[PDB]
């Protein structure tokens, strides 16, 4: 009866079902957990918001077209405006979180295409000016739930001031490595003939027990079309990709007034 | 060494000291506590924000003058815009809280005056029109940290629309009972010759285990000058009264999008 | 509904409500649907980004035809009233495309689902009363 | 031949019944019967369905 294709995930007041899964990945074989006393750093009693924040948040959907080059998000950036998770994140200097990432993309038995879904620790990307190095604005690095897109062309700006964004070049994974090697990162593939969803469970990953969520993204989420969307009756068809992410084992330290980041 | 006059209270990252206290009141002899499984109602796993929210918040100070008739606040209304307590309150349908109320008023050995400090369950007050009954706007009932003032005169409005506020008449406690009987409510007195602070620890009080904090104030806080401020060198002198309140054993149910109440 | 008709013989209700959805498109139709319950006191959700902050389930359409969303018992009062009443308001149930429904060619591009409601085992009613759903001329 | 039974609790507790009539039809209401088996209406299926398992395997 039980199947690698059929899964239920419940966190807080939220449940996901899938009937065409392909198992689930636990990044580096490690389930998320709370911070042990023997690895702790800040000494204030932490906030552990539990079900208020540790629940599935669904981002705005994106459209997969035959011409799409791919999509990226950063975490916890993508969830910074999500209910009580966002409030706990911005009221505290420090936060840590694992995640359940659920990527959703259904089609038909007559569609074809394959998405690589990669969870990348410290997903540092190239800037878009050759007048400077490491020259990216906070606003362009932290787009929130809209994330960003890859391009198949690199056109760095004439003026340094116009190039303060990522050069998200697909085949170099936006960071000077070949995209074919992205499989060293925790991943699944959504191959439309096989599966309609990817599930990645991510532990907290950092060189520290806990860090400034508003300064630092622990994970990149990359969705690359490895094989282009094709549908014989309409080559210009679009199918949605929906990203749903639950924080897990969230813990916050250093309560004060709320952080309100710059928007320009 | 230990004295009824000298007290330290620590909640979360916040500490109060007083060197001229008069013991402390525990309303109805009951310390606040979390909601037991055998008295529970909503079935979702509650949020218990602990140190993020269960900490001392200091309101704007008010000025005690020889002509002051008194001050009122409602709880949890007075704390609705206070850090993570306010966020937890408005992100949830349901909340319960106890409080430590610390009222602060120092003067000199040459000043005189006495404040009655009363914690009143279900502090329902009279409206200011005789064209209607029970005719108070949400905005006037819920002033937040600024609270309101008592008057020694009742001047109900000509037009029903102009009288949608409390008739906070001091000697009738704004509710048709004699102020001299307010001592049946949990209270202390700040008598300037004796003490410079009042401390009241309040359990959650309601006919329910948990309720809608945005709809319903569980407690009124009333400060009445029982004996007027007097200072021989300057009868027009003013001394501050500062109100500092810590939520305690806070518990929230029914997470959703944030409540944003009407402001007009 | 059968539940609604029974509730209209009672004044008070308590407990969790079960909403079960049956997708009746073709086998070739795929999709993900968000089903949400938002407890009351905030802006009623009209967008997926507000709905997903409440209690919700992401339903993947597939071989298992049906998905159950719960409105868990989340109330100030121990009972709600079996009338329209601000004090005992229950909140908001909404539904959005999580991705979209996708079909191949030669397949209907519009289709239906059926929504069912039932009470959970935590559910009870009290204070018997006459219903407003039957009457006669005199 | 008095029957002593538990009352339904109120705000804050036995009661006594004697039957006066030779016909059971004369008796007061039947005692509370909390019997129920919703599954005969909610799950009248031949083959057991385990909630955690797929409904259709």
């Amino acid at each position: 009866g039980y199947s690698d294709r059929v899964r239920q995930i419940t966190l807080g007041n939220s449940t996901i079902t899938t009937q065409e899964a392909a198992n689930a990945v636990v990044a580096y074989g490690e389930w998320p957990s709370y911070l042990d006393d023997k690895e702790a750093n800040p000494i204030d009693a932490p906030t552990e918001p539990d079900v208020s924040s540790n629940r599935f948040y669904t981002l705005d959907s994106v459209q997969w077209k035959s011409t799409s080059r791919g999509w990226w998000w950063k975490l916890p950036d993508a969830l910074k405006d999500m209910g009580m998770f966002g409030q706990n994140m911005y009221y505290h200097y420090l936060g840590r979180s694992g995640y359940t990432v659920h990527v959703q993309c259904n089609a038909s038995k007559f569609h074809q295409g394959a998405l690589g879904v990669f969870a990348i620790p410290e997903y540092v990307m190239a800037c878009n000016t050759e007048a400077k190095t490491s020259y990216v604005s906070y606003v362009n690095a932290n787009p929130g739930e809209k994330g960003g897109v890859f391009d198949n062309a690199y056109n760095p700006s004439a003026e340094a001031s116009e190039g303060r964004k990522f050069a998200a070049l697909d085949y170099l994974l936006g960071c000077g490595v070949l995209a074919g090697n992205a499989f060293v990162y925790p991943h699944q593939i959504i191959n439309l003939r096989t599966n309609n969803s990817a599930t990645l469970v991510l532990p907290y990953v950092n060189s520290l027990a806990i860090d400034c969520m508003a300064k630092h993204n622990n994970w990149g989420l990359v969705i690359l079309p490895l094989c282009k969307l094709d549908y014989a009756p309409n080559s210009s068809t679009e199918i949605p990709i929906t990203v749903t992410i639950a924080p897990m084992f969230t813990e916050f330290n250093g309560l004060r007034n709320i952080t309100v980041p710059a928007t320009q | 060494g230990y004295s009824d006059r000298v007290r330290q209270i620590t909640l979360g990252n916040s500490t109060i000291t007083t060197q001229e206290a008069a013991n402390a009141v525990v309303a109805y002899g009951e310390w606040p506590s979390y909601l037991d499984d055998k008295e529970a109602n909503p079935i979702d796993a509650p949020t218990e924000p602990d140190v993020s929210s269960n900490r001392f918040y200091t309101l704007d100070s008010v000025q005690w003058k020889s002509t002051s008739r008194g001050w009122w606040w409602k709880l949890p209304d007075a704390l609705k815009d206070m850090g993570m307590f306010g966020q937890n309150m408005y992100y949830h349908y349901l909340g319960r809280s106890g409080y430590t109320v610390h009222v602060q008023c120092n003067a000199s050995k040459f000043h005189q005056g006495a404040l009655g400090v009363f914690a009143i369950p279900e502090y329902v007050m009279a409206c200011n029109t005789e064209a209607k009954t029970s005719y108070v706007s949400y905005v006037n009932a819920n002033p937040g940290e600024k609270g309101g003032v008592f008057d020694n005169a009742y001047n109900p409005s000509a037009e029903a629309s102009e009288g949608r506020k409390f008739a906070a008449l001091d000697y009738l406690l704004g509710c048709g009972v004699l102020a001299g009987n307010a001592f049946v409510y949990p209270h202390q007195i700040i008598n300037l010759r004796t003490n410079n602070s009042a401390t009241l620890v309040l359990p959650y009080v309601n006919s329910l285990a948990i309720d809608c904090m945005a709809k319903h104030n569980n407690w009124g806080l009333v400060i009445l000058p029982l004996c007027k401020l007097d200072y021989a060198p300057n009868s027009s002198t003013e001394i501050p009264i500062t109100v500092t309140i810590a939520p305690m054993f806070t518990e929230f149910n029914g997470l959703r999008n944030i409540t944003v109440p009407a402001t007009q | 509904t059968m539940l609604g008709e029974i509730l209209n013989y009672y004044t008070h209700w308590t407990g969790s409500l079960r909403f079960t959805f049956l997708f009746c498109g073709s086998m070739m139709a795929t999709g993900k649907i968000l089903l949400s319950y938002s407890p009351p006191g905030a802006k009623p959700p009209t967008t997926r980004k507000d709905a997903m902050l409440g209690t919700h389930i992401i339903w993947d359409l597939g071989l298992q035809s049906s998905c159950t969303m719960l409105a868990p018992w989340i109330s100030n009062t121990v009972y709600r009233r079996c009338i329209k009443d601000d004090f005992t308001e229950g909140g908001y149930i909404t539904c959005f495309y999580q991705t979209r429904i996708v079909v191949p060619s030669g397949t209907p591009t519009s289709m239906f689902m059926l929504a069912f409601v039932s009470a959970c085992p935590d559910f009870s009613v009290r204070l018997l009363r006459d219903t407003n759903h039957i009457s006669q001329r005199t | 031949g008095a029957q002593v039974s538990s009352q339904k609790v109120g705000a804050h507790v036995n009661y006594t019944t004697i039957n006066y009539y030779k016909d059971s039809a004369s008796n007061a209401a039947s005692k509370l019967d909390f019997s129920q088996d919703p599954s005969k209406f909610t799950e009248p299926v031949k083959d057991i369905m385990i909630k955690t398992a797929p409904a259709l395997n």
Binding site: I9, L11, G12, T15 | A45 | S65, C67, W73 | -
Partner: peptide, 27 residues
């Protein structure tokens, strides 16, 4: 005899999927 109590439960990440069913069965 009382209506059902609610047990303490946390989250899941599982091949157990009680949220999905098939009401075609008559259940």
């Amino acid at each position: 005899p009382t209506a059902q109590s609610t047990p303490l439960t946390s989250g899941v990440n599982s091949q157990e999927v009680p949220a999905l069913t098939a009401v075609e069965t008559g259940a």
